[PDB]
Write a protein that binds this ligand. Structure first.
Ligand SMILES: *[C@@H]1O[C@H](CO)[C@@H](O)[C@H](O)[C@H]1NC(C)=O
Ligand SMILES: *[C@@H]1O[C@H](CO)[C@@H](O)[C@H](O)[C@H]1NC(C)=O
Lengths: 282, 49
């Protein structure tokens, strides 16, 4: 059965200077190299999808599937107990290949398959005392799966910290893009202090993986997991508990940047060109 | 591919990074492909006569 559980509320914030990655797997030391590639423009709009999860009162769907456009910059503040991946596709049905990303507590599973499911993806996890480890069922949550073609497994992308400070630290800055047959996904995990949203400063996004697929994507969505205390009952309001499943979204556009590398070759700075007259001058 | 002198390097390498570079597009360093070591490519001593 298809059910919705997220109280998706769309507020607006500024993009500031977050989401610029390393253009290619090439090192440079102490150079002011300048690039031209899809990136999140500075001081842009971020649709803060502030929300409360674990709510049975939102049974009707209220979260539209966000567009993919020319690159999506993503950030979150939730552990693997809340958010567990991203969904990409063109029609998000069994007619076109759908990319489903699941981030297990011990591994990462990426599957491209003709998944048939509704517009409310979720994963309900609970360690019942009968076995202390219960496995989810694809047939229950998802309607169908046909002609699965690509499967990839790796280590956890979310080295989540149990502490609340670490819980806020988990800024999984995952730029997703499809260029030259390449689904490039970068990574970041800042130990930055807790706040409300994207703080100041800059930190480049190192390549998490470069899948050799790079197919066009139209709709992008956030796959979240049902947060539970491993002791609450099942299908009840006293089961899935309320919690803030906040996740932000950006949008990449074609843009030229002036990078700046430190001694280690990390991109320690990036500036835009078409931002302002000073940016064009620089 | 190149010709030069492979010398030990005192420069730290970011683990993500593969091979060195200089401002004038020159490969002035290279991580050893067999094991994680950084080797500076010193130009051969050619001057003139
Ligand atoms: C196999 O993949 C194709 C996509 O090229 C899809 O149209 C088809 O439904 C899948 N299944 C079978 C049995 O062909
Ligand atoms: C970066 O380089 C500086 C100086 O070369 C050094 O002090 C610092 O420890 C390096 N950082 C990393 C992460 O390698």
């Amino acid at each position: 059965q298809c059910v919705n559980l997220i109280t998706r509320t769309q507020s607006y914030t500024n993009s500031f200077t977050r989401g610029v990655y390393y253009p290619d797997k090439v090192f440079r030391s102490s150079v002011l190299h300048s690039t031209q590639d899809l990136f999140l423009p500075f001081f842009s709009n971020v649709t803060w999808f502030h929300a409360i999860s674990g709510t049975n009162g939102t049974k009707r769907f209220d979260n539209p599937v966000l567009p993919f456009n020319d690159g999506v910059y993503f950030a979150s503040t939730e552990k693997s107990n809340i958010i567990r991946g991203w969904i990409f596709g063109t029609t998000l049905d069994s007619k076109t290949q759908s990319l489903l990303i699941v981030n297990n507590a011990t591994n990462v599973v990426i599957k491209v398959c003709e998944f048939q499911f509704c517009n409310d993806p979720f994963l309900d996890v609970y360690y019942h005392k009968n076995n202390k480890s219960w496995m989810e069922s694809e047939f229950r949550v998802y309607s169908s799966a046909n002609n699965c073609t690509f499967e990839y497994v790796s280590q956890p992308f979310l080295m989540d910290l149990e502490g609340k400070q670490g819980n806020f630290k988990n800024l999984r800055e995952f730029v997703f893009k499809n260029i030259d047959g390449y689904f490039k996904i970068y990574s970041k995990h800042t130990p930055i202090n807790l706040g409300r949203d994207l703080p100041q400063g800059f930190s480049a996004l190192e390549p998490l993986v470069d899948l050799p697929i790079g197919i066009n994507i139209t709709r992008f969505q956030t796959l979240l997991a049902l947060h539970r205390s491993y002791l609450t009952p099942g299908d009840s309001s006293s089961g899935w508990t309320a919690g803030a499943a906040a996740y932000y979204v950006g949008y990449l556009q074609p843009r030229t940047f002036l990078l700046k590398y430190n001694e280690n070759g990390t991109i320690t700075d990036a500036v835009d060109c078409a931002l302002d007259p000073l940016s064009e001058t620089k | 591919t190149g010709t030069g002198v492979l010398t030990e390097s005192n420069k730290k390498f970011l683990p993500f990074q593969q091979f060195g570079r200089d401002i004038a597009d020159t490969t002035d360093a290279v991580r050893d492909p067999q094991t994680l070591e950084i080797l500076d490519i010193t130009p051969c001593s050619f001057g003139g006569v």
